[PDB]
Amino acid sequence: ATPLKLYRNIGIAAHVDAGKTTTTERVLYYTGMSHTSAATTCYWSGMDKQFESHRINIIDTPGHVDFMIEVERSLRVLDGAVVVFDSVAGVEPQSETVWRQANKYGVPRIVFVNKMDRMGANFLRVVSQIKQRLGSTPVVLQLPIGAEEEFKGVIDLIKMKAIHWDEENKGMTFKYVDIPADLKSTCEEYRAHIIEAAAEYSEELMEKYLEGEEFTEAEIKKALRHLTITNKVVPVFCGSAFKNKGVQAVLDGVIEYLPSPTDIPDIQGVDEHGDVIHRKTSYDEPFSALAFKIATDPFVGTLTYFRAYSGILKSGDTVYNSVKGKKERIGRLLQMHANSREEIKEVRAGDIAAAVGLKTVTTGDTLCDQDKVVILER
Ligand SMILES: OC[C@H]1O[C@@H](O)[C@H](O)[C@@H](O)[C@@H]1O
């Protein structure tokens, strides 16, 4: 039983030339080696095994922006987003459309500027587009070591260490080395911007910042986490998914800066008589879930993917489809992994799973406790 705080429900929002496919495949690979489905579960304990094992649910966010109801729905199903931009093209209209919806729903996010090895790659230009065009406050947490043909890795500005990923094992191991002499002053300039952003978190840190006292790494990360979750800043990372130089550090960022289910506000809906109500992120609350994808499997038949917001659902329970006005009995429950499919007997608040063989459910339907009815969408 994984506690709620170790969950990370995320979406990888990437369009056009950003490299969504390769980024997603690298995520599943690194997580799989450490120890397309509508939602895939994986585990991550950090690039250097420095964290507890977190359970990451990757929700497939539509690569298209043609079906906007689906984009909005995917943003309520995930809790945090990893937005990927192409280092050459930068911010383009399709990612801009999604970013405005993320803002409308208050979705915290981190950014990964991919393709740092491509001709024309310009990291800081993308960063200025985020600030100027998207109207967010990026906080740069890494600088690339070179660009184009000369791209060798990235620098972690909080730790002030260059990261060298081993070529031979496709980036499964790495080493922290000294920042190259020629980049040291620029790294210090950018690190100061991180302290400045973190200082806004509390009066204690503001005092330390104004007086010139040193921040500890834990203080910095605590502040950046809160600021990210409350949509005040957007941490920015960079690298290359294909070259196996970057996604590993982005995964650490998912853990360190993106929300667990308890970090975001309680979901809002209406009862059957139009009264506004909420469902708390708790096992003690009545069950509620939103169905977000209906897929046909050749082996077991239909798979109904849903996000549970509250309560606990067990195989054999009778629930209510509050949109159709019909009771549904839950049979088998599954969770998809990169290369396997795991049978489970219950799904708790904050998790995502697929129900086998349901009859009444279509996308957007709410499944809930028969006695305490809620409609989460329309
Ligand atoms: O230890 C890595 C991270 O784990 C998360 O579950 C905590 O909420 C963070 O404060 C911490 O930085």
Ligand code: NA
């Ligand atoms: Na959300």
